Chain A
Amino acid sequence: GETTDGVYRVMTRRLLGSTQVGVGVMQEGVFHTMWHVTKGAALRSGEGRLDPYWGDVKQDLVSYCGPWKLDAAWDGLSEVQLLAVPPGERAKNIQTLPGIFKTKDGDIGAVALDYPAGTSGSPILDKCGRVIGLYGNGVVIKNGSYVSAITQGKRE
């Protein structure tokens, strides 16, 4: 299958037409997405099969073919880019200064950008192009607009 580094759409044919359920990142031969996109199911890349290797419903993350590889972190200061990949629409970088989710376990970067559900798993990058996390798990605010966490895994 296609193992080139980059960003990919996650498609299903189990509904009407070909429906985009989310987005993910291929790095060092590992495919990285959010748990709620695949529910831990196997994926196809042409003829090639991609099997789950690691996942965690609480982190809402999952890796295929190998361990989570993405370890860059928001620096807490700089603007970032959401490389949004919406259903039916070309990949598009959106530059933003993240806000903050304050939790009992620590502070997390958050990006206040609204996109369709199927955009879940789109990568968030730093100025060096390193993926600092994925878009698609967050919260609806007073306004009615969406704030996503910058969700990052740990690399062993």
Chain B
Amino acid sequence: DMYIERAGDITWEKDAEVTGNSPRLDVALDESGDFSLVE
């Protein structure tokens, strides 16, 4: 049995850690909601 606890406000924070790349990926989405790489 499952419960929720508040964790913060939803706000854009100026000067947050900038990181991560921006890949363009060919993908398929199946009936079960699972993404896969089309190669």
Chain A residue at smallest Cβ distance from B34: A137
Contact string against B for A residues 122-156, beta-carbon threshold 8 Å, 1 for contact and 0 otherwise:
01011111010000011101000001010000000
Chain B CB within 10 A, most for which of A8, A101, A102: A101
Q: Is the CB of A44 within 8 A of B8?
A: no
Q: Is the CB of A125 within 8 A of B12?
A: yes
C-alpha gap A41/B33 in the complex (Å): 18
Q: Is the CB of A4 within 8 A of B28?
A: no
Contact string against B for A residues 7-24, beta-carbon threshold 8 Å, 1 for contact and 0 otherwise:
111111110000001011
Residues from chain A with Cβ under 8 Å of B37 in the complex: 139, 141
- Shortest CB-to-CB span from B26 to chain A, Å, is 5
Number of A residues contacting the other chain (C-beta, 8 Å)? 68
Tell me whether A30 is interfacial, beta carbon within 8 Å.
no
Partner of B4, one of A2, A35, A83, A90: A2
C-alpha gap A137/B36 in the complex (Å): 11
Q: Is the CB of B4 within 8 A of A102?
A: no
Q: Is the CB of A45 within 8 A of B18?
A: no
Q: Is the CB of B9 within 8 A of A6?
A: yes
Residues from chain A with Cβ under 8 Å of B18 in the complex: 79, 95-96
Q: Is the CB of B31 within 8 A of A58?
A: yes
Q: Is the CB of A81 within 8 A of B12?
A: yes
Q: Is the CB of B22 within 8 A of A99?
A: yes
- Shortest CB-to-CB span from A43 to chain B, Å, is 5
Contact string against A for B residues 1-39, beta-carbon threshold 8 Å, 1 for contact and 0 otherwise:
111111111111100111111111111110111011100
Known: A81-B12, A138-B35. A11 touches B20 (CB 8 A): no
- Shortest CB-to-CB span from A11 to chain B, Å, is 5
